[PDB]
Amino acid sequence: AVQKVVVHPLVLLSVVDHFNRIGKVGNQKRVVGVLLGSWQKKVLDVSNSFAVPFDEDDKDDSVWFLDHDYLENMYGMFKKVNARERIVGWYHTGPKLHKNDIAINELMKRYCPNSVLVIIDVKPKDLGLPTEAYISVEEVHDDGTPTSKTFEHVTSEIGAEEAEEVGVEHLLRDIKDTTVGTLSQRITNQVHGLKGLNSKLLDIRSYLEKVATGKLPINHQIIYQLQDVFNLLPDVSLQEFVKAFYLKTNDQMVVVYLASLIRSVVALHNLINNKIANRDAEKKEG
């Protein structure tokens, strides 16, 4: 179990550079490499990466090559440069999960049993994080019977040391709007969150359409999950809930009202001071 995985901006930018270099080389649609890092008691720390030659057969998802010898050599050289970093997992730039993923992970699982897979999309058509992390686990079914290995999603985020923060903030002079005040807490959310929720619901709806129209089979764990989802949705017509909501909105209003009174008094004071200063300047001038 991993409670959290933190990637570093350098890793993201390095993967983007890798994809650019291969695509410039062309005739590819995905890239694969490694991820270096350490552990902090279940709070992973990915900090660096390098490439690993790889190729695949698009038509059939059972042919692939991954020069593990390159991986061992590069691990030697990197470990020579920085000892504190040891292999942590592997990454690839395909949009969404592929079928080979379990095969590669079982290959990778030799270098680090607790290997986490981090997908880094390089063309985000969405409003959300650029990475997804996945950990391979055995899944036992109540009816699905055979025990395979499926990826379980684990929380991921982006983190940076002071040097990386300085560099990124320097490069981010292409657009910048801080307005930490209400503008940010209303653009970074509300709108953003509603857009993301809508996109997720639309994906669920597309799958439901596909199942209903016969294009797919039925999965029972999904149906149970969706039933639980629909059972969670709260009801907003209970007198108790309305009462509570109004009570809290009222408290919030009294506080904002006090704030506005304060602000009005201060602005009036500023006007008075400016008027007095103007009058004094005129009298002295006259």
Partner 1 sequence: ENSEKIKVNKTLPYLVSNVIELLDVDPNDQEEDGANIDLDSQRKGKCAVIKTSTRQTYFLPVIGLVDAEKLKP
Partner 2 sequence: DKDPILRRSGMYTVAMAYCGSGNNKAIRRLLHVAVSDVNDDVRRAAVESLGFILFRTPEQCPSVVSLLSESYNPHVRYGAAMALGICCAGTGNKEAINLLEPMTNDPVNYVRQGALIASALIMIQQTEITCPKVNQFRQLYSKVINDKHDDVMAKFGAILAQGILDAGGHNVTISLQSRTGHTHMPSVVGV
Partner 3 sequence: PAVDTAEQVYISSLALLKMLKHGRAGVPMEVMGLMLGEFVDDYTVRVIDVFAMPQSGTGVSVEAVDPVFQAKMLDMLKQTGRPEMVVGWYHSHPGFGCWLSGVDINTQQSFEALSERAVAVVVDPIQSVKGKVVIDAFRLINANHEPRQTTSNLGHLNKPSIQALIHGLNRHYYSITINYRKNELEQKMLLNLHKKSWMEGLTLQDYSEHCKHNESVVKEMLELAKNYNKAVEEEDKMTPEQLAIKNVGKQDPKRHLEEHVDVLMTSNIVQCLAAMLDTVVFK
Task: Name the site residues for partner 1 (rule: CB under 8 A).
Answer: 80-84
Q: For the chain, how far is it from start to end, CA to CA, in angstroms?
A: 81
Stretch that binds partner 2, among 67-75, 86-94, 135-143, 172-180 (CB under 8 A): 172-180
Pattern of binders to partner 2 over 173-212, x per CB under 8 A?
xxxx------------------------------------
| Spatial CB neighbours of 235, under 8 Å, sequence gap ≥ 6 | 241
- Determine, following the binding rule CB under 8 A, whether residue 99 of this chain makes contact with partner 2: no
- Determine, following the binding rule CB under 8 A, whether residue 170 of this chain makes contact with partner 2: no
Rounded to a whole number of angstroms, the minimum distance from the CB of residue 285 to partner 3 is: 16
Stretch that binds partner 2, among 8-16, 171-179, 245-253, 254-262 (CB under 8 A): 171-179
Full DSSP string of 101-134: HHHHHHHHTTT-TT-EEEEE-SS--SSS-SEEEE
Cβ closest to partner 1, residue 84 vs residue 176: 84
Cβ closest to partner 2, residue 174 vs residue 235: 174
Structure token pair of residue 279:
């009058």
User: In which residue are the tokens 């902090």 written?
Assistant: 40
Cβ closest to partner 1, residue 161 vs residue 203: 161
Residue 219 backbone dihedrals phi, psi, to 5 degrees: -115, 125
Q: Which does 229 bind (CB under 5 to 8 A by kind): partner 2, partner 1, partner 3, none?
A: none
Query: What span, in angstroms and rounded, lies between the C-alpha atoms of 74 and 78?
Result: 6
Rounded to a whole number of angstroms, the minimum distance from the CB of residue 79 to partner 1 is: 9
Structure token pair of residue 79:
């470990």
**Residue 92 three-state SS:** strand
Q: Which does 84 bind (CB under 5 to 8 A by kind): partner 2, partner 3, partner 1, none?
A: partner 1
Query: What span, in angstroms and rounded, lies between the C-alpha atoms of 107 and 104?
Result: 5
DSSP 8-class letter at 16:
H
Binding site for partner 2 (CB under 8 A): 173-176
